[PDB]
């Protein structure tokens, strides 16, 4: 169940000597996707190997949306996403909705985050360009 | 100014437990760009945080090409590339033209390889399409 998420900044010194910085957050796996660990370069919402980070907004703003959260999940997997992380803060409904795709469940894991862990995540993304996530269990 | 390049493949297991495979490699940093070290996902020849990896073909095939090497180099950095690795194994003279950019050098490192290090890379990039690069010095 619990999905451990490491976010990893990387940064070089003029020397060549580099330094890497890492941040632990925790969210859950959606039964909508696999129970695998995974990793790639983060992307907020190609070539393969990337991690969608998707902030869900209130559905009041999006009464009937383009794609449902699942659709967005699956859409991501088919653009190469090695995994997908929704921030479900603004809409706790997505959890309930995410977890209705156990029948035809994606082959890449599908994690949501909320509250204090969601806010850590978002702060790192927005402040820095490069960034790779690991997602474990 | 020797570049130590490591290509790194991730491969989860059903358990959550996972495995990393790292293949070291050597190259050269061109004066056309920086003497930093960098990290990012690999792309052979939109995102921020990638390492382009360009094979250069025998320069008869392409007599007057769209872009030069250094024009390629700069296209990738313009499009986010955190570095660029050219494969010059089939076009040795690229080295010469890369290093005439050494009073305009690019923010991101520009690196090349050739011969056996070249193959290793190319071998790994194709056989699996989900690969990560750290580049040193």
Author numbering:
A (entry chain A), B (entry chain D): 54 to 98, 113 to 204
What does the paper say about this structure?
Direct extracellular interaction with Rspo proteins inhibits ZNRF3/RNF43 activity.
The ZNRF3ecto crystal structures revealed a distinctive variant of the protease-associated domain topology. A disulphide bridge, conserved across species, links two structurally elaborate loops, β3–β4 and β4–αA. The crystal structures for apo xZNRF3ecto, zZNRF3ecto and mZNRF3ecto showed no major differences in the main chain conformation. Comparisons of ZNRF3ecto structures for proteins crystallized in several different crystal lattices, or for crystals containing multiple copies in the asymmetric unit, consistently highlighted an acidic region (N105-E114; residue numbering is for mouse sequences unless otherwise stated) within the β3–β4 loop, the short αC–β7 loop and the extended β1–β2 hairpin as flexible elements of the fold. Our crystallographic data provided independent structures for multiple copies of the ZNRF3 ectodomain in eight different crystal forms. This dimer is conserved, and pairwise structural superpositions yielded r.m.s.d. values of <1.3 Å (for 275 equivalent Cα pairs). The interaction is twofold symmetric; strands β3 and β7 of the ‘subunits’ abut face-to-face at the core of the dimer.
